[model samples]
Target: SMEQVAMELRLTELTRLLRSVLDQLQDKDPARIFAQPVSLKEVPDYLDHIKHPMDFATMRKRLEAQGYKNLHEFEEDFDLIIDNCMKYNARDTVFYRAAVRLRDQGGVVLRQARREVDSIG
Candidate 1:
């Protein structure tokens, strides 16, 4: 059986590395800027945001409003978020949404944690 500590350590390391890239890209702070106050509740609005696909281009523009210079630069950071979500949680709802949006044209989001997930064009 896999020990929790080892798994946690790996997750921590992965998150750290991902965050570093986000930092390098100078993206807006996620808690403050990116996700924003969709709601103050811990549980997000399930129907609205989750039920429908988000417009990545519009979201990118919003991130820019909060000072994230280029959405292009944060592509890796975004992919890491989805990949980590699948690897660690395996929660299907979030994963499905992520997969769909990421595959959408002009989305350019790399959803899987495979070799192709390197955020190449």
Candidate 2:
């Protein structure tokens, strides 16, 4: 159909335009085009950023103050915080998101933690 053909052409043009713009963006900021990879050992620290609920503030601060190079170093405390959030019905907040992220990545986190400690010593 003629209408379908026209729509296809329009879509193609838009895609080309977007690609061109993205290329320009990447050219201007190559760093933005690339990202530093986080090891699973680092996931807990990253998840620690979801620290805005006030009640978790003390725990988060204490965790950050410690030199935790591996998840195992803080996994118990992290789980405690997660359990607290679960008990308090923190489902709608960033704490829930962090908890789910931690759980989903637990396997890799353990492996990475082992590798990190091995590399350290």
Candidate 3:
């Protein structure tokens, strides 16, 4: 159930991103904008787990505290998600699902950070 929920949330976000990318691609000239932004479709192998056993909560907490609010905080979240995914969702399907979620979350974090920093600047 947890995996299902996580996968659904991730798919929702990925769809949104894909739509945005398509819109941008349609509007922009490929020759002029030579370097399109990088889009990550997968997370590392370790993050599709359902949950940490009993004592690994501390790891997640520590990961969340890594102070990545402005810059790309996805690395921190990626580490956390991979750690948990390995613990709970070792299967290939679950692993892929977790990876999708991890990627989506990282993208969202960077997008928000960009917006926040731009507003401040």
Top TM-score hit? 2
Query: Which 10-residue window in model 1 sums to the lowest lDDT?
Result: 29-38
lDDT of 3 by residue, 9-116 (tens): 655554444334323432332232212221125434322433322112332343344322323343343454445444454457644464445445546555664574
Model 1 clash pairs are none
Using alpha carbons, what is the TM-score of model 1?
0.27
Off by over 4 Å in 3: 1-70, 73-91
lDDT of 2 by residue, 7-45 (tens): 666555444433333233223322321112223374545
> Evaluated with lDDT, which candidate comes out highest?
2
Give each model's whole-structure lDDT: 0.39, 0.43, 0.41
Winner on TM-score (2 vs 3) = 2
lDDT of 3 at 45: 33
Question: Candidate 1 on 17-121: residue-level lDDT in tens?
Answer: 434444433233222222322232654543343332222343444444443333344464454444433443344665445443443521422233223324431
Candidate 2 lDDT score at position 92: 86
Lowest lDDT sum, 10 consecutive residues, model 3, at 30-39
108, model 2: CA deviation in Å?
2.2
Question: Could you tally the backbone clashes for each prediction?
Answer: 0, 0, 7
